[PDB]
């Protein structure tokens, strides 16, 4: 037997699936979603980290001159100075008063802790969804991990389950994101090779162990002060620390739909959106034949109390006449109210009690016990507590039944007005007829 259904993607919401085939007793199905994970496929662009400025000792030549050649080093800057007179702790350094020369250079290289502290720039693509779903029917109660792609097929008690695909293709990650430690940011970044000093991306590297580096930090040297041996330099501070100071608000405290965001790997968990179609193929050994199933006749329903709250605020009692004891599957054929128990025990006494939850002022639904079917309708009162720490356990519906009190008032007023208008139309028609016949 093959069946198809749709279920809501909300964590913790119980779902009852009803399956009926000729020649077999109805069976009920319990499927609950425990945890959902949404992972996007990422490709790295570049990484960034703080730096150090390697400045070596100056070269001082007494009575001579020097020239320096360019080097293939990140942001190398050399400059040769004329007319200098060093001093040291003992005395002068060279005889020549004005025939001297000092050679200065400096460059920038990534810090020694770049491998432990760095920020990565990624690009988000189409994202996949995986979930952990539990299945309950009969005497089997198992939890399985499933890919929600329309391709995965799991087996539970000799039954094939095929999930997905998700109805809504919505992802909370933008096209370009930045990941640091355990936070993600929807922030665009400058392209590789075009960084700007003082901000994010002044240093870029294709990977953590890459031997090539691109640095643009605006290093400039300066002429040494008279009678001193030093190499001065003015440079814009590191952009990584600046980004670390006013990066902004992390997406961990901005994601809609209550999506918890983790890293390693980058994923968003417990997102509430869309519906998951379910396709299945049951075996014939999971049902029960009619001959050995109980028969329920003359079943009528009533409701004792009702209060539309987030819990199961409502009880209803079923009266019936049977032939033998047994266990029956019970389900609500509507959406306004959701039951709690999936199976019930029937006895010769002729009374069973059920719990249910709703959100409408006056619900109406059809409750089925085994092969029997009966209708229920009731009036519910609002609750008093304002705020509760658990999510709602009812599908959100508010419209009352056609036979509810307010709709009854509307119906009776409209009926009176319509009858009055119909009478007026009839009197106009009869007057027109008698006038025309003359």
């Amino acid at each position: 037997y093959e069946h198809s259904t749709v279920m809501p993607n909300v964590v913790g919401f119980p779902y009852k699936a009803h399956i009926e085939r000729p020649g077999y007793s109805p069976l009920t199905l319990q499927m609950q979603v425990v945890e959902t994970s949404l992972e996007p496929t990422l490709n790295l662009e570049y990484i960034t980290c703080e730096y150090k400025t390697v400045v070596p000792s100056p070269y001082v030549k007494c009575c001579g001159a020097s020239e320096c050649s360019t080097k293939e080093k990140p942001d190398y800057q050399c400059k040769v100075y004329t007319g200098v007179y060093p001093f040291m702790w003992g005395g002068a350094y060279c005889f020549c008063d004005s025939e001297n020369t000092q050679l200065s250079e400096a460059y920038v290289d990534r810090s020694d802790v770049c491998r432990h502290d760095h920020a990565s720039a990624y690009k988000a693509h189409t994202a996949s969804l995986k979930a952990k779903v539990r299945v309950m029917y009969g005497n089997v109660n198992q939890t399985v991990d499933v890919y929600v792609n329309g391709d995965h097929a799991v087996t539970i008690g000799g039954t094939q389950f095929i999930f997905g695909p998700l109805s809504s293709a919505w992802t909370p990650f933008d096209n370009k994101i930045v990941v640091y430690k355990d936070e993600v940011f929807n922030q665009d970044f400058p392209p590789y090779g075009s960084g700007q000093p003082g901000r994010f991306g002044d240093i870029q590297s294709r990977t953590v162990e890459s031997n090539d580096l691109y640095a643009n930090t605006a290093l400039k040297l300066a002429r040494p002060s008279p009678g001193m041996v030093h190499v001065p330099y003015t440079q814009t501070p590191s952009g990584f620390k600046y980004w670390l100071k006013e990066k902004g608000t992390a997406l961990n405290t901005k994601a809609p739909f209550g999506c918890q965001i983790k890293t390693n790997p980058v994923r968003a968990m417990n997102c509430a959106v869309g519906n998951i179609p379910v396709s299945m193929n049951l075996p014939d050994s999971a049902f029960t034949r009619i001959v050995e199933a109980p028969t329920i006749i003359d079943l009528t329903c009533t409701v004792a109390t009702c209060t539309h709250s987030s819990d199961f605020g409502g009880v209803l009692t079923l009266t019936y006449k049977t032939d033998k004891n047994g266990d029956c599957s019970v389900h609500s054929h509507s959406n306004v109210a959701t039951l709690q128990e999936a199976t019930a025990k029937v006895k010769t006494a002729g009374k069973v009690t059920l719990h249910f939850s709703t959100a409408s002022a006056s619900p109406s639904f059809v409750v089925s016990l085994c092969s029997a079917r009966a209708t229920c309708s009731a009036s519910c009162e609002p609750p008093k507590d304002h705020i509760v720490p658990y999510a709602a356990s009812h599908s959100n519906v508010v419209f009352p039944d056609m036979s509810g009190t307010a709709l009854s008032w509307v119906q009776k007023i409209s009926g009176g007005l319509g009858a009055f208008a119909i009478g007026a139309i009839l009197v106009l028609v009869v007057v027109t007829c008698i006038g025309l016949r003359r």
Partner: protein, 104 residues
């Protein structure tokens, strides 16, 4: 290595009609943030230093607020309002207006 932090005091919760007013009693500068779990959330975060009181809306979809170093706490609001849903016509009018004003 693994190093140690203190957990901030739990705050005082006062209920209301789709609203929560919190009392904060910090001993240090702590970070207080909240968000709503709807389509378009209303995020907020700040560095509390002294004793203040804040009011956070709690729509039917839900709220989550992160105080200090504790785990975040979520709250939801029930469908509560005034009037009687089975009385004279003005009573049900008042009830449904209290639930959803503009549509009624």
């Amino acid at each position: 290595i693994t190093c140690r932090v203190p957990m901030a005091r739990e705050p005082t919760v006062i209920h209301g009609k789709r609203e929560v007013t919190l009392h904060l009693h910090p001993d240090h500068p702590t970070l207080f943030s909240y968000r709503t779990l709807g389509e378009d959330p209303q995020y907020h975060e700040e560095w509390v230093t002294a004793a203040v009181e804040r009011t956070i809306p709690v729509p039917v979809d839900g709220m989550e607020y992160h105080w200090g170093n504790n785990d975040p706490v979520r709250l939801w609001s029930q469908l509560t309002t005034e009037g009687k849903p089975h009385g004279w016509p003005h009573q049900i009018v008042q009830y449904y207006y209290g639930l959803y004003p503009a549509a009624t």
